[PDB]
Design a binder for this molecule. Structure first.
Ligand SMILES: *CCCn1cc(CCCCCc2cn(CCC*)nn2)nn1
Ligand SMILES: [Cl-]
Lengths: 8, 163
């Protein structure tokens, strides 16, 4: 499962 | 479809960066739900949600952004907000109509994301808006099954034991 876009 | 223009790429950048003035200039009915073709098909809203660009999120919601838009994995913006811990953003999305029990292609909900990433206040928020903690993803796992052992606050929350 690949990561959604974003940061935190 | 016909892909993106340079202006569309400029909009996606502004949304991820929090450059709200640029987003206001570039957002059109034709561009507000464009997709990042070379990435994972995030919309401006996916980016602004994931990168905690609250002013951008507010603007986009008020100018036709699709709260329900799916990226290549079936993530909607609320997944991104929850994964990355952005509470105000998550609340905003929920206020506009985001589906709290939405599942991606792998049947991960926003609560699975928040649990896995150790975001207690996001888990609590989602619960306060009707998130179902019994939902199982494609691996058979509930949000609780994704919680690290050190996140005992989250474990208590999902068992029914938090203050
Ligand atoms: C599905 C997750 C994909 N993923 C995450 C990682 C860890 C490295 C990521 C780099 C960390 C990073 C991103 N930013 C931007 C600001 C939030 N700053 N550091 N690998 N793969
Ligand atoms: Cl912002």
């Amino acid at each position: 499962r690949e990561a959604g876009d974003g940061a935190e | 479809g016909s892909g993106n223009s340079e202006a569309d790429r400029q909009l996606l950048e502004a949304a991820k960066a929090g450059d709200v003035e640029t987003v206001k200039k570039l957002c059109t009915v034709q561009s507000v739900n464009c997709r990042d073709i070379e990435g994972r098909q995030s919309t401006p809203l996916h980016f602004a949600a994931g990168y905690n660009r609250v002013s951008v999120v507010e603007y986009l919601l008020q100018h036709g952004a699709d709260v329900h838009a799916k990226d290549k994995g079936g993530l909607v913006p609320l997944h991104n907000a929850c994964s990355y811990g952005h509470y105000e953003v998550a609340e905003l999305l929920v206020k506009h109509g985001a589906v709290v029990n939405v599942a991606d292609l792998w049947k991960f909900t926003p609560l699975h994301e928040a649990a896995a990433k150790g975001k207690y206040e996001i888990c609590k928020l989602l619960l306060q808006h009707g998130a179902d903690p019994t939902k199982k993803n494609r691996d058979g796992n509930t949000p609780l099954d994704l919680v690290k052992d050190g996140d005992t606050d989250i474990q208590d929350l999902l068992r029914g034991d938090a203050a």
